[PDB]
Design a protein around this ligand. Structure first.
Ligand SMILES: CN(C)c1cc(Cl)c(C(=O)N(Cc2ccccc2)c2ccc(O)c(C(C)(C)C)c2)c(Cl)c1
Ligand SMILES: CN(C)c1cc(Cl)c(C(=O)N(Cc2ccccc2)c2ccc(O)c(C(C)(C)C)c2)c(Cl)c1
Lengths: 218, 210
């Protein structure tokens, strides 16, 4: 069912979605480091710091994103970043040590409980990598973010991706005509989450340089 | 009373020296992040430091960093910034999730060294003297380090006689504060020393440089 052009759109979304790569140093810390509230927080925030970078990269490569007005590009990424990070974080769980660090990191259950139920609801959907990648592009190119001067130009970028995802939900899950709707339902659900804690964190950058002090590069 | 050569040393050292709970924790670790960088640049400028063998340079800075950081935190804390009378930094510390285990001795040390009415020159010389401690683990040439440390102790002991001649205890009190820092538990600070925290809140996310 995909067209050649639909195949190519999908191809370039997958290459840029892959190429995401979490340094082994970060993933090794999860098992090996001390478990204490401060170390746990610094490890989760270092991972999230890697995710923001990957997210911003992925956004800049999205098909047509660079064609948009520069002030609207800023506003689109500002509006979408929290929900896109939430979606990313789910992929990381779907790790038993990672959860125990999250549950003793000083972060309030106010924010941990909704996220963990969200992860379960995502695992139930049996999402392919192709489906994560498309849904991430879709949440990012949302034409209704605040502060967008030209909503129709963002609609033009989003709509081809919505078409491709819908065709993929038909092919891969013919017995479930409600698969596509249920994917979009997860994005609807993220918009209802409390974004305030994530917005407070979104500008912070945490990196472990545990290289001799004397040889460190600033 | 300082010799011309001692004045040359002092002015050089001074020129080199003059270069929610989660949210409070990030702010404090960002400040400390800046302090490590300053401390490392100051160390590289110490007279003679670059002439030491490379492994002894690494050993000195590694073995002395915690103490030098604690001394820098005392200098900042007692300045009560930005006003000279603000309790903001103390309030952030008390609500940052850091345990009383680590806060209590730091506060006790800030009060103790605060009563000595430290000058910047005293801080700069005491930092240099901490870093050039010849007795650290893993130093091969202890005698060369001791030779670098000695003229700084000499300048500092003179500065104490010049500026506090009625308080002959003053140099001894400075050395006793260094023994306190050496004896404090370093485990928490060693855990934090390699972490680097910065708030990139001045650009939109799209324009941030990675
Ligand atoms: C840029 N920084 C330092 C951020 C830190 C966090 Cl915790 C978050 C954040 O709120 N979360 C959501 C979350 C998930 C699980 C429990 C509490 C909060 C976030 C976003 C991406 C992530 O990879 C993670 C981790 C915990 C899975 C690393 C967390 C974000 Cl958005 C940014
Ligand atoms: C490189 N990083 C992120 C460090 C963080 C801290 Cl809290 C510390 C640290 O242990 N202290 C000591 C301390 C002071 C007050 C309460 C608890 C612990 C440290 C070192 C330099 C500092 O500037 C600070 C602050 C609290 C004054 C920012 C703290 C160190 Cl050494 C390094």
């Amino acid at each position: 069912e995909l067209t050649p052009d639909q195949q190519t759109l999908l191809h370039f979304i997958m290459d840029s979605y892959n190429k995401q790569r979490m340094p082994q140093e970060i993933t090794n810390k999860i098992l090996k480091e001390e478990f204490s509230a401060e170390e746990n927080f610094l490890i989760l925030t270092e991972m999230a710091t890697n995710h923001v970078q990957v997210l911003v990269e992925f956004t800049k490569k999205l098909p047509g994103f660079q064609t948009l007005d520069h002030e609207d590009q800023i506003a689109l990424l500002k509006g979408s970043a929290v929900e896109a990070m939430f979606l990313r974080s789910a992929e990381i769980f779907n790790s038993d040590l990672l959860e125990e660090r999250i549950r003793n990191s000083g972060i309030s259950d106010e924010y941990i409980t909704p996220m963990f139920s969200f992860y379960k609801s995502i695992g139930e959907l049996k999402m392919t990598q192709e489906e994560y990648a498309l849904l991430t592009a879709i949440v990012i190119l949302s034409p209704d973010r605040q502060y967008i001067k030209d909503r129709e130009a963002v609609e033009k970028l989003q709509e081809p991706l919505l078409d491709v995802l819908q065709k993929l939900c038909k092919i891969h899950q013919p017995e479930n005509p409600q698969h596509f709707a249920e994917l979009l339902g997860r994005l609807t659900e993220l918009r209802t989450f409390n974004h305030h804690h994530a917005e407070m964190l979104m500008s912070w950058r945490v990196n472990d340089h545990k290289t001799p002090l004397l040889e460190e590069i600033w």
